[PDB]
């Protein structure tokens, strides 16, 4: 029954200068769990859909780094034990995306990241020629 009357909204000001035009935003998530990466991908793609922007998906290959350690302590050269870290990549491209849309979306996604994942942005913006040229 307790439903607020008037929802207070933040202030927004449209600066006189024009907003920057991002040509393509390519985000890359490096993770350990393919299931976590798939959940994060579903989250991001649904957010982009509901915001009304383009999207493509593809799964780059799995990279691994492994290394051998001595299994025992003092004298055992033939008996070793191995270990490996598996990093899984997931890339997502967003096309024809306005600067403010980019800011809001990246803020949302960065706040809604999971823990065991690293996120790499490549921003691609176009511009006309300078005045000295």
């Amino acid at each position: 029954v307790d439903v607020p009357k008037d929802l207070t909204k933040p202030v927004v000001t449209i600066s006189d200068e024009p907003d920057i035009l991002y040509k393509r935003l390519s985000v890359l998530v490096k993770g350990h769990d393919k299931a976590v990466l798939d959940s994060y991908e579903y989250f991001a793609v649904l957010a982009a859909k509901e915001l009304g922007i383009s999207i493509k998906v593809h799964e780059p290959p799995r990279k691994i780094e492994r290394f051998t350690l001595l299994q025992s302590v003092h004298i055992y050269k033939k008996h070793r034990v191995q270990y490996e870290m598996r990093t899984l990549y997931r890339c997502l491209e967003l096309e024809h995306l306005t600067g403010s849309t980019a800011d809001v979306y990246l803020e949302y996604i960065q706040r809604n990241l999971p823990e065991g994942v690293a996120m790499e942005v490549t921003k691609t913006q176009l511009e006309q020629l300078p005045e000295h040229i």
Binding site: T8, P10, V11, V12, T13, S15
Partner: protein, 118 residues
Amino acid sequence: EVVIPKKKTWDKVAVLQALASTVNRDTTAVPYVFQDDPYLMPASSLESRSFLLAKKSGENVAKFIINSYPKYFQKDIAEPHIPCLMPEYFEPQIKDISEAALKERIELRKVKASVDMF
């Protein structure tokens, strides 16, 4: 010829104000300051008062330890330097009537002022 959307500027807190106003208060749930498990769940006003007062007392204990041993937390490991996290300095400097007088309004006490008037 060309249409361009105009730029806008936001406060760092404004976005999260929007996110918070988006969601209403939690229903059938104690304040967020209190824990979630049922055993720690404060189930009465007096005990809840005592609980968050014990938390505040721990905060004061933290203040005491930091201002008693500043050199331990002196390392500014975090890239953004924050005086809120830096240790606190209510230490009178060497005898210097002018700098001591300037430091009067910094130390916020009365014995220093008596000694300076003297």
